[PDB]
Amino acid sequence: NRTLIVTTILEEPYVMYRKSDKPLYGNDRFEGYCLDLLKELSNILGFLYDVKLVPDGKYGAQNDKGEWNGMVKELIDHRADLAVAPLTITYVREKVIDFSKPFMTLGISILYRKGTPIDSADDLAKQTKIEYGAVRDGSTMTFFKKSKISTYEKMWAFMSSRQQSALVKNSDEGIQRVLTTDYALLMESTSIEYVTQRNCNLTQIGGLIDSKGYGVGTPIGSPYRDKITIAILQLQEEGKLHMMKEKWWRGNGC
Amino acid sequence: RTLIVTTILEEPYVMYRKSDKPLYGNDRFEGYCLDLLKELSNILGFLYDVKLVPDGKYGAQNDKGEWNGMVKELIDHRADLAVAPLTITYVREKVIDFSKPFMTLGISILYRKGTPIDSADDLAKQTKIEYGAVRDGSTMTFFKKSKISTYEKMWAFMSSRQQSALVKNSDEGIQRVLTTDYALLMESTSIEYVTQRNCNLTQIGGLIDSKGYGVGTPIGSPYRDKITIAILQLQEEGKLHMMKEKWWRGNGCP
Ligand SMILES: COc1cccc(Oc2ccc3c(c2)S(=O)(=O)NCN3C2CC2)c1
Ligand SMILES: C=C(C)[C@H]1CN[C@H](C(=O)O)[C@H]1CC(=O)O
Ligand SMILES: C=C(C)[C@H]1CN[C@H](C(=O)O)[C@H]1CC(=O)O
Ligand SMILES: [Cl-]
Ligand SMILES: [Cl-]
Ligand SMILES: [Cl-]
Ligand SMILES: [Cl-]
Ligand SMILES: [Cl-]
Numbered sequence: 001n002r003t004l005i006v007t008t009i010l011e012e013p014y015v016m017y018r019k020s021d022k023p024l025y026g027n028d029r030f031e032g033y034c035l036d037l038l039k040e041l042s043n044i045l046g047f048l049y050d051v052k053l054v055p056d057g058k059y060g061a062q063n064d065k066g067e068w069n070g071m072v073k074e075l076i077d078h079r080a081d082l083a084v085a086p087l088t089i090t091y092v093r094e095k096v097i098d099f100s101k102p103f104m105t106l107g108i109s110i111l112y113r114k115g116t117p118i119d120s121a122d123d124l125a126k127q128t129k130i131e132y133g134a135v136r137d138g139s140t141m142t143f144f145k146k147s148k149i150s151t152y153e154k155m156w157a158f159m160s161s162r163q164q165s166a167l168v169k170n171s172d173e174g175i176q177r178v179l180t181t182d183y184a185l186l187m188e189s190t191s192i193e194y195v196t197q198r199n200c201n202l203t204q205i206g207g208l209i210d211s212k213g214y215g216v217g218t219p220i221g222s223p224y225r226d227k228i229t230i231a232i233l234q235l236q237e238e239g240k241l242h243m244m245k246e247k248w249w250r251g252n253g254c
Numbered sequence: 255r256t257l258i259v260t261t262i263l264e265e266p267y268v269m270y271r272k273s274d275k276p277l278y279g280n281d282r283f284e285g286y287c288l289d290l291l292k293e294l295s296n297i298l299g300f301l302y303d304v305k306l307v308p309d310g311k312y313g314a315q316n317d318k319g320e321w322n323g324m325v326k327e328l329i330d331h332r333a334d335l336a337v338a339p340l341t342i343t344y345v346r347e348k349v350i351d352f353s354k355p356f357m358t359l360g361i362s363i364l365y366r367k368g369t370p371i372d373s374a375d376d377l378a379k380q381t382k383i384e385y386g387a388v389r390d391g392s393t394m395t396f397f398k399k400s401k402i403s404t405y406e407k408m409w410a411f412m413s414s415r416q417q418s419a420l421v422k423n424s425d426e427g428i429q430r431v432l433t434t435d436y437a438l439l440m441e442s443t444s445i446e447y448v449t450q451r452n453c454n455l456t457q458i459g460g461l462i463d464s465k466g467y468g469v470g471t472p473i474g475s476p477y478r479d480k481i482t483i484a485i486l487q488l489q490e491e492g493k494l495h496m497m498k499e500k501w502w503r504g505n506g507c508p
């Protein structure tokens with residue numbers, strides 16, 4: 001039967017290895033928000049699918065020569081039909097793949113410890129005692145690199161100084177850096193919500209710096225893009241996306 | 255070729271400019287959507303003629319499947335773009351091609367200040383306080399179509415007594431909230447506009463759903479993808495945020 005290849009990436013709570021006492025195979029290896037979304041999308045549109053982790057473990061960014069990696073590259077090269085992941089819809093990516101409409105909203109915000117006077121990005125940009133950074137090569141880092149807003153230009157100049165020592169390789173490294181040192185992590189708000197539900201010592205600082213979403217990636221010209229968009233809108237209007245987020249985000253309270 | 259842009263009078267998106275003499279053409283209008291059009295035209299390089307939608311409607315279908323409003327202007331190729339607070343919904347996205355969203359919103363509650371009402375559940379539980387929505391808009395449709403028990407209950411109340419709880423437009427609803435014991439179900443962007451200016455009113459609770467306004471194009475339009483990319487660029491450059499601040503900022507309230 002026609003089976004779509006879905007590229008994705010391990011990222012809590014979107015895609016995680018399921019825990020079992022024996023080896024797992026196929027789609028049963030995984031669970032998480034994105035698996036539930038795939039199940040709902042397939043139920044509406046009637047397609048079969050095979051989840052496959054992106055081989056290089058990357059979301060998708062450009063090098064100096066305009067060459068892409070990650071899930072974006074898998075779509076460009078027609079090695080996957082869909083990308084289902086917290087793949088941020090951005091200008092540079094939308095030019096080379098097709099995105100569905102967003103299934104989740106988010107903005108860049110600040111993850112930091114509780115109990116401090118810091119209240120906004122302006123509070124970080126004006127000083128240098130508190131170190132701050134972002135995940136290297138993600139859409140958050142790219143936002144600061146490209147911004148012409150004075151405050152975010154200043155922050156990029158700090159972040160990019162000293163061989164980019166303020167950046168981190170992944171979100172888990174950044175979270176541990178926040179917990180151990182005087183460091184603030186610039187992180188997508190949905191991930192902050194997940195983290196602060198589980199670490200009562202951490203909080204979001206200020207509001208959202210920008211406004212964007214995660215969408216399902218398809219190769220340019222894909223006939224599934226518009227169908228997936230429609231299904232996402234249906235799931236939103238029925239309240240199902242809200243229930244899915246609550247299912248996977250809610251912690252044990254603080 | 256010069257593009258025909260369908261739109262609708264709605265504060266602060268599209269308003270008649272103020273002048274001492276008769277105005278002509280695009281110079282008749284000002285507002286957020288006119289600023290957005292100018293920025294889209296600068297990026298993509300098109301000329302445009304703004305034309306108010308002749309029947310003064312956003313877009314809904316009747317029992318026989320015929321559409322009206324700005325949606326119908328696109329369907330019949332009498333407009334190339336629709337630039338308005340036109341909510342992206344399942345039923346509309348099936349018949350036109352929306353750009354990606356340029357502004358986020360959700361359904362929420364406009365009510366007077368100083369009361370113990372705190373959520374839609376508080377309204378659904380009782381009958382002393384009347385509540386409704388604008389007739390034939392996406393908000394009314396959300397409640398009509400919901401299967402969530404609370405929203406089914408509220409729709410039962412809203413549609414009773416020949417729909418006396420509904421209003422013809424937002425200004426009528428705002429005046430009803432101010433004068434009587436009435437709560438208006440309203441898109442959060444409009445609530446923010448109103449409460450910035452009228453300190454007797456407030457938003458009750460949070461957002462009931464999550465959606466956005468998109469630029470409409472006819473199915474198959476080659477402009478939809480280009481407009482999406484331009485919107486993403488404008489968001490990442492902070493220009494969409496500046497445009498919202500320009501038109502929404504009021505004095506605020508204690
Ligand atoms: C720059 O302005 C922006 C950026 C990002 C989203 C947005 O507005 C939304 C918000 C949500 C949303 C949609 C559009 S949708 O109608 O495109 N798909 C369904 N959802 C809900 C599942 C999330 C506006
Ligand atoms: C978890 C990672 C590295 C991803 C998820 N969304 C962003 C993206 O799609 O680029 C990255 C986060 C960020 O850059 O803050
Ligand atoms: C102002 C009006 C009637 C419009 C604006 N967006 C919705 C739409 O596009 O249907 C309507 C508001 C609402 O239904 O609360
Ligand atoms: Cl399957
Ligand atoms: Cl690597
Ligand atoms: Cl490439
Ligand atoms: Cl300092
Ligand atoms: Cl915010």
Ligand SMILES: [Cl-]
Pocket residue numbers: 300301302303
């Ligand atoms: Cl023009």
Ligand SMILES: [Cl-]
Pocket residue numbers: 099100101229352353354482
């Ligand atoms: Cl789209």
Ligand SMILES: [Cl-]
Pocket residue numbers: 366367368369456
């Ligand atoms: Cl209050």
